[PDB]
């Protein structure tokens, strides 16, 4: 069986990961046959963190990109496709300064050309590619395409579809596959993939990313209360207020110090109430919303969530020994954790330290989004899994992109299946 392979960089708000994925030749069009075969993560802050020293970006990729020519056979390089696609980090980069923007990707463009794989280009994604990507991984790695069933004996209603939800650093997506009628053409998607139709409904919310959220809850922490909630008692930084308040997530908190004192108290209650204020529920222009007047049908189906909603939930139940099984076991571990001092936190992670403050803040953001903001209870909470991987490869937008590019996914099978799934 002769492979092929194919490269993804997805160039995040936080990290740049590069995944190498490869298939056989004679079997391309299957649904779940292309797996991933490696993958190397990029030291560093991502792309858009170079946005004062472009040069930098491309030269970030290199060590992986090295690794990628010893991953492939050698053989292979010159007809194994090669694509950077990056997400919310690039978009706010871009509504700071296009200029910018374009200079990065000028720079990872000059030295992704340099290698020998066949190199498709570098983009922005858009959020609703980001949102419909992750979907199509996601149910692709499961076989949820396949027509499962035989001649005169199909089963119906036809194999169900795993939504999808991603939080990453800078803006989080929630897509699903949906019976209710679109009120918002911005959040319809519609795909033929195997000869079958899927409504989706997808959506982005920019500034929702875990690392954006960290900022806003930090900035209202400062205008508000001068101490921060969501910290444990006994930990404290200086926090240099030009970074806080730089983001377009955060430049509307704007309230001459440069530099200020500011130390936890482990007070649950003033956290989640900080953190209900980044929802906004006062108005809906359409029959129902999630949240900040965004239309969204009700939630339905099984849901994989990845990225940062596994991290968070992996620290509460592998780190701090709680269960998440139900809506309120999430939200009392939330409340414990934010609870604990700083002391006590730390004495439960012997190694490096972190991102361990926050974890109170993130988890308490978790379960206002998926409660407050999406509107799960605990029916339709019961058929959400926390996973970041699938048939051995990460769950991401990663490798659908790589699936719509080569354009492996067939919108019709061979022969329409002489017209047996009609
Ligand atoms: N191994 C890990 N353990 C705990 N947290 C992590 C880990 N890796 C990443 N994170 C954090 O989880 C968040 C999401 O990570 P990731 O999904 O890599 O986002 P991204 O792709 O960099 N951002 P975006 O461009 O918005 O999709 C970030 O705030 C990371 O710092
Ligand atoms: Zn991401």
Redesign the pocket.
Same mark, same amino acid.
């Given at each position: 069986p002769a492979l092929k392979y194919g490269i993804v960089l997805?160039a995040? @708000? +936080?990290?740049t +990961?590069m995944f190498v994925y490869k298939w056989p030749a004679d079997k391309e069009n299957d649904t779940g046959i292309v797996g991933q075969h490696s993958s190397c993560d990029v030291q560093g802050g991502?792309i858009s963190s170079y946005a004062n020293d472009p040069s930098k970006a491309g030269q970030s990729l290199v060590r992986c990109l090295e690794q990628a020519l010893r991953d492939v056979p050698r053989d292979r390089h010159a007809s194994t496709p090669l694509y950077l696609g990056a997400? #919310?980090?690039m978009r706010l980069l871009n509504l700071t300064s296009p200029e910018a923007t374009a200079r990065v990707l000028e720079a990872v463009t000059q030295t992704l050309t340099q290698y020998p794989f066949d190199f498709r280009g570098a983009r922005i994604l858009s959020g609703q590619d980001?949102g419909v990507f992750g979907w199509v991984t996601a149910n692709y790695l499961l076989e949820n395409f396949i027509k499962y069933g035989w001649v005169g004996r199909w089963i119906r209603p036809r194999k169900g579809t795993l939504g999808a939800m991603?939080?990453? %650093? #800078? +803006?989080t997506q929630i897509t699903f596959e949906t019976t209710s009628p679109s009120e918002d053409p911005g959040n319809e998607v519609h795909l033929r993939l195997y000869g079958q139709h899927y409504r989706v409904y997808t959506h982005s919310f920019l500034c929702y990313? !875990?690392?954006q959220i960290l900022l806003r809850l930090l900035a209202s922490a400062l205008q508000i209360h001068r101490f921060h909630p969501c910290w444990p008692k006994g930990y404290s930084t200086q926090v240099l207020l030009q970074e806080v308040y730089q983001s377009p997530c955060t430049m509307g908190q704007r309230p001459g110090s440069a530099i200020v004192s500011l130390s936890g108290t482990s007070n649950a209650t003033l956290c989640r109430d900080l953190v209900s204020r980044l929802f906004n529920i006062s108005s809906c222009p359409f029959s129902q919303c999630s949240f900040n007047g965004v239309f969204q049908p009700p939630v339905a189906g099984n849901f994989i969530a990845f @990225? #940062?909603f596994y991290?968070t939930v992996d620290?509460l139940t592998t780190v701090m020994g709680l269960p998440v099984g139900t809506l309120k076991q999430l939200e009392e571990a939330t409340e414990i954790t934010c609870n604990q001092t700083w002391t006590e936190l730390q004495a439960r992670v012997p190694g490096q330290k972190t !991102?361990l403050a926050d974890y109170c803040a993130v988890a308490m953001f978790i379960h206002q989004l998926l409660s407050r903001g999406y509107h799960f209870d605990e029916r339709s909470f019961r058929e959400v899994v926390f996973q970041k991987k699938a048939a051995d490869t990460a769950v %991401?937008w990663a490798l659908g992109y790589m699936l719509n590019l080569t354009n492996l996914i067939p919108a019709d099978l061979p022969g329409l299946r002489k017209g047996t799934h009609f």
């Open positions: 997805d995040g @708000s +936080s990290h +990961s991502g997400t #919310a980090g980001e991603d939080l990453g %650093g #800078a +803006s990313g !875990r690392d @990225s #940062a991290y620290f !991102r %991401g």
